[PDB]
Amino acid sequence: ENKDMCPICKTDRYLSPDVKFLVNPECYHRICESCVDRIFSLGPAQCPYKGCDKILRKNKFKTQIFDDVEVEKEVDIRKRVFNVFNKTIDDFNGDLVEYNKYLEEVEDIIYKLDHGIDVAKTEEKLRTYEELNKQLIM
């Protein structure tokens, strides 16, 4: 933000923040167009975000600008939960309490995924999402 925006244009809050300081879905850090365009043009290269080593992938990025990437990732985890539970049976019978209980489980899957303090259900949530995907695919 104020001083964490780019390995090149770090103080980009007042440096005409017009270039997309986008976030690679597998890097989770602010990378300016001066930096990211140097990277994905040749392919999956890592960026020097204060000496970072996470790979900036190919032309598959997403828009995250100024939306609290960490919370946005938690929102994305919630969105991933929202995507995993896009076709989840919550009100298939109309029961609100069951939907209320079902909503808690999906949020817990996001909560397990988006927390990372002692994330072990997070891997299970992916398996549960895979189980949900197994339910979704079948």
Binding site: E72, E74, V75, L103, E104, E107, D114
Partner: protein, 754 residues
Amino acid sequence: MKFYIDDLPVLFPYPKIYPEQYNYMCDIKKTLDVGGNSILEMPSGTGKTVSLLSLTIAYQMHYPEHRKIIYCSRTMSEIEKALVELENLMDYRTKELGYQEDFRGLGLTSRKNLCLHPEVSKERKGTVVDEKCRRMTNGQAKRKLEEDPEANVELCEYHENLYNIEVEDYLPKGVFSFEKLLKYCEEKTLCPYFIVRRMISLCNIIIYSYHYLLDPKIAERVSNEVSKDSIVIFDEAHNIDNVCIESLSLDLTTDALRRATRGANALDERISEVRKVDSQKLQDEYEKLVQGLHSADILTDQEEPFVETPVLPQDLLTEAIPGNIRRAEHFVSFLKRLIEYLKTRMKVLHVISETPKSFLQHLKQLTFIERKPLRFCSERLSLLVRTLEVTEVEDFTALKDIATFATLISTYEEGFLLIIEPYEIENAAVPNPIMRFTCLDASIAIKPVFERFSSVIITSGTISPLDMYPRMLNFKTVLQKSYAMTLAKKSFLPMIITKGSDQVAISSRFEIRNDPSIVRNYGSMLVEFAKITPDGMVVFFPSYLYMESIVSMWQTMGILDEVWKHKLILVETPDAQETSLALETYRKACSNGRGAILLSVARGKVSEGIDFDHQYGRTVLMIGIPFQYTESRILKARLEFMRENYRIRENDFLSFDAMRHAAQCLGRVLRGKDDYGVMVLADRRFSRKRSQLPKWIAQGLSDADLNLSTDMAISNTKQFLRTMAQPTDPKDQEGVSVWSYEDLIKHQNSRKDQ
């Protein structure tokens, strides 16, 4: 005096009376007979409080039904004025009759001025002083004190000696004025805060600021025992419609959004750290959420409540489980999802007034969070925080506003408005967006108080016309009548200086800036008063920024030394502490031989609560028309709402509202009929609004006083002062306007029974 209104003794504390008072007395009992609203205009020059209290106090002591009486004033400063006035009348009522009171009547200002603990009293911020004693004397802190012997938790000990002696009875028999209360409570090392807190169900009359009636976050402890069958009294309530909308107003700043993230992230740490230690209670509280809203201990809280009820007092409340939000980690997650969405909605490049629905739906489109559970933020936060038993609030101060806001907007729609400025125009071209939000109809909060009671009293010396407010607050009164000042002498010269010495139509509407053609004319116009006027002279700018604008160049002008060469000059200061010191010294200088001259803003706080007697109020100045559209169309937004909701346009309301605020200041020049003072005004448009004035003020305004020049006006006021300075004591025609002691009111009014 002791006369009758055909039904009740009237133990009037003063030997003298006034013709308005009996007419005032005639209607109050008549209204008291038929519990209604009965908006009435009583001139501020007369002390309506005496006519107010005397008939009401007798009414409770004569009619044995209305054992509880409620008066809501604008300021606690008025309360102490009422507190002593009742005390004097209560002494007089005993004085005329002996001892027939057995009465309980006290004021209500705040914990800040009633927390008698010196350390908590030493703290400056009202939030902290409330929070500190709340924490210092807390339902859980005392457990940390009593259950675990430790110095970690201290106590006010005023709340303790409250529980020792005070929570068995009341203060012995006094109708304690704030000075008398504080003097008594300190000697008893008692807490007048917790005293009135428990004395809610005990005071036979209660006096407090409108907010304790209006502000639901403090109008929540309402006990129907003292409320239902009671009477509500209002004076100078004209400048309260704004307060009502202000009470539902809410300004936001992205710094506070970061402060919200500061608190909200700290919540994640707070919930996690206790979760490792004791999440079983949190799990238990989840069951406490599973059974319902946990009203068992979210309301039954002696000193526990962290988040109050910012929304109207629990009227629009659901109590079921919040679905998935039951989990605190989930609860914060949507909140964290929200604040950034709020930030994403705060970062708007321009000003947007977003509808409560479309914005909510837009949120749903962005973050699929439901409206009904969103109201639960206030209850959940108050519930969760105490379970977290947090030791601080400053990081969480931003959060309760969200718990306020998120509940509010989720509860409110099509009567409120969310508007997101990208900056402030006064400091534009810089990023400071505000997600401003407020209500639109003041009667929305007035409707429950409309609903709860029938006997309600509203009065003002300023209200004009008495018909906008029934239109504004959408209600029916009984008597819509204005009282005129029965004065056989002028005692005030209303002067409309449309034309200056230059005979220039002079105005404040032209700009919020300076033009010496108008300004230096004003400066030249002003100085001549300083020489002729005695100690006591105030100005009222339309805007504080406008106030400062004219100050510096007049300081640059040579106009400044001469008034100092004539009298003393005291300024309006952003901190009331220096302003108060100025005010008392100004009055001290007004009391002193060296003359004192003041300068304020028509919208300033001095016009809200501070009255000035003959010496203290001598020459009031209205610096142009007090106008408010220096600010944005948020005025227009509500006005456009007003225009569509009510068939009242801007200027008609503006002239009504501006002259209301104009007359709001002017009521402070007078103390009694002995008081006097010329009322000068300087604006071109002032001539047009002769109709908008209150009756007695309009009656006191002759048509020859319109668009006058200052020079001719100087001659006009010149003779006025000497005549008023002359001891005009006919002692025979006074009784016409005095209705001589206990006789003419008895004689004349009984003669006038036809």
